[PDB]
From Swiss-Prot, chains A, B:
EC number(s) given by UniProt: 6.1.1.26
Swiss-Prot/TrEMBL GO biological process terms: tRNA aminoacylation for protein translation
Keyword terms, alphabetized: Aminoacyl-tRNA synthetase, ATP-binding, Cytoplasm, Ligase, Nucleotide-binding, Protein biosynthesis
Species whose genome carries this gene: Methanosarcina mazei (strain ATCC BAA-159 / DSM 3647 / Goe1 / Go1 / JCM 11833 / OCM 88)
Record-level GO cellular component terms: cytoplasm
Keyword Aminoacyl-tRNA synthetase: yes
Role summary: Catalyzes the attachment of pyrrolysine to tRNA(Pyl). Pyrrolysine is a lysine derivative encoded by the termination codon UAG.
Reaction equation(s) it catalyzes: tRNA(Pyl) + L-pyrrolysine + ATP = L-pyrrolysyl-tRNA(Pyl) + AMP + diphosphate
Membrane spanning stretches: none
Location of this chain's protein in the cell: Cytoplasm
Protein name in UniProt: Pyrrolysine--tRNA ligase
Similarity-based family: Belongs to the class-II aminoacyl-tRNA synthetase family.
Originating gene: pylS
Amino acid sequence: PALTKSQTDRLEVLLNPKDEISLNSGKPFRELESELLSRRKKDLQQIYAEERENYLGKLEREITRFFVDRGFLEIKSPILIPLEYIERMGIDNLSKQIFRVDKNFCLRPMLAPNLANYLRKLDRALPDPIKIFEIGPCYRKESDGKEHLEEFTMLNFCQMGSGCTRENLESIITDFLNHLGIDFKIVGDSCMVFGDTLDVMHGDLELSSAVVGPIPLDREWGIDKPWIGAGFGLERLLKVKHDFKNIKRAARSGSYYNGISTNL
Amino acid sequence: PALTKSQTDRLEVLLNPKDEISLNSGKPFRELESELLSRRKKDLQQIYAEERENYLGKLEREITRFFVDRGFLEIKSPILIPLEYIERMGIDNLSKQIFRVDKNFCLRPMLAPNLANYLRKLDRALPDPIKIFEIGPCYRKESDGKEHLEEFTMLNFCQMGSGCTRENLESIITDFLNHLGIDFKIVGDSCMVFGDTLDVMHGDLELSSAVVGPIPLDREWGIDKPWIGAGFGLERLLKVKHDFKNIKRAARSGSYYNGISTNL
Ligand SMILES: Nc1ncnc2c1ncn2[C@@H]1O[C@H](COP(=O)(O)OP(=O)(O)OP(=O)(O)O)[C@@H](O)[C@H]1O
Ligand SMILES: Nc1ncnc2c1ncn2[C@@H]1O[C@H](COP(=O)(O)OP(=O)(O)OP(=O)(O)O)[C@@H](O)[C@H]1O
Ligand SMILES: N[C@@H](CCCCNC(=O)OCc1ccccc1Cl)C(=O)O
Ligand SMILES: N[C@@H](CCCCNC(=O)OCc1ccccc1Cl)C(=O)O
Ligand SMILES: [K+]
Ligand SMILES: [K+]
Ligand SMILES: [K+]
Ligand SMILES: [K+]
Ligand SMILES: [Mg+2]
Ligand SMILES: [Mg+2]
Ligand SMILES: [Mg+2]
Ligand SMILES: [Mg+2]
Ligand SMILES: [Mg+2]
Ligand SMILES: [Mg+2]
């Protein structure tokens, strides 16, 4: 009844959180693999027959509706951005985590720079307060492990003008995570782009970093009003919602569809 | 009444297709600029007050519903892909249009490789026929002009197994563009990745290239069944729908929101 590392890895790929199957049950590999293969095929067949929606896409749509309905403008900004945005976010040569493209471009590691540009520009046209959000891919070179991806999906919402207080920021975070049914706490932390943050924690998992401005970086971006904002990783939200052991189950991938192995 | 090139460019930025304003009317720049600025601020204020949805995001959601409701599985696959996928799509060192990332990766220039992988894998689990689609960013270095972007958004749908005929492919294209209200014709063309294509044309604008397999490239991807597929550019669909002069009005950008200049 002794399984090799390769056999255990194959079974872990096929195991899903809802299964009440122990790989250490004492059953031989052939029977555990056959059982899990049958369950996962059934799971994919049910998805194909009924809903057909991708978890990341569906969560993006649900989040989009939530923020649009609360008065935030939906932004879709470039993923491929000037490398100069990095230096100007105060990221001195995190900078090592940047995927570079050609000589003067990079894949955005966060949504903040593009959203700062939109806050500044929209403040010339829209009534106070300015409320915007974006959901989309971001990129960082990571270690990684069970909680970091190199290609992940960020939500960042922000507001500039009136109402940009710690209590309003916390209230939006609370309403949002209550909508998703996710328990959390808020702890204070610091990072080097923004200074002090409010970190939104689910256990020992960071779901979001949030900031109450103004901060001295604002001048580099032409921001000259109070502001609040928060960034959330969608794959981390999915990891919590579906109780995935590893965040890769939630990622853009050819190896899992809605957390189900595609190697069947 | 003579406007400089810089003045005309500024007015063209602020002009929208619905305006019945001629820059050559004889009015001075100051009055044309003031009028257009007021119209565009009004337009953005109305968007902010009412719908708040981004054109690219909203079109993606509408397309997603169309294909999900017709039995296609929604895919979200990596944007950052192995450079090896390029060579294996038969793209010999289009290859010059690839944005390279590090030494062994690139930004995907098309959705086909990831979708071929999903067709192959899903054929081991799902009943015939296999029907899938993806919408998302793709990247090519272009010239460019009024119809090409370096960062654009592709829809690619495909089917493998039964029903993979020219007539079914045309029927899906027809139902899809009828749903969007876009007139078109089909013309034969060729490309070097897929061979003969059916090009979906709106006037002299190519909306899609479509392929009826099998093709000899299939073996490199483990595809061994009949298949059909088509790829559409969402920004080109928006250019037609909103009568934009230049495709940049439709792109991910900090310079236009739903075709309205953000420089106000
Ligand atoms: N590599 C990554 N993979 C997946 N999600 C991420 C990654 N980096 C950040 N996120 C998500 O984006 C949110 C805001 O990003 P932020 O810039 O605060 O990241 P972070 O503080 O470096 O995260 P961590 O401390 O876990 O590395 C995070 O709270 C997390 O949900
Ligand atoms: N650079 C681009 N910018 C915007 N849309 C594009 C671009 N390249 C391709 N598309 C869209 O993707 C669809 C399928 O792409 P395909 O690989 O057939 O491109 P293509 O034939 O090179 O386009 P074109 O002939 O106009 O350069 C095209 O019909 C078009 O709608
Ligand atoms: N993941 C991010 C943390 C996200 C916190 C929210 N940030 C935001 O809403 O930015 C908009 C903004 C507005 C005004 C001035 C400047 C700026 Cl950036 C990080 O890397 O710390
Ligand atoms: N824009 C693209 C044209 C898109 C046409 C549709 N292609 C497709 O559905 O691929 C799936 C697929 C299935 C099976 C075997 C191989 C493959 Cl690729 C280009 O660059 O010509
Ligand atoms: K389990
Ligand atoms: K990924
Ligand atoms: K016009
Ligand atoms: K773009
Ligand atoms: Mg980090
Ligand atoms: Mg952190
Ligand atoms: Mg953080
Ligand atoms: Mg081309
Ligand atoms: Mg062409
Ligand atoms: Mg083509």
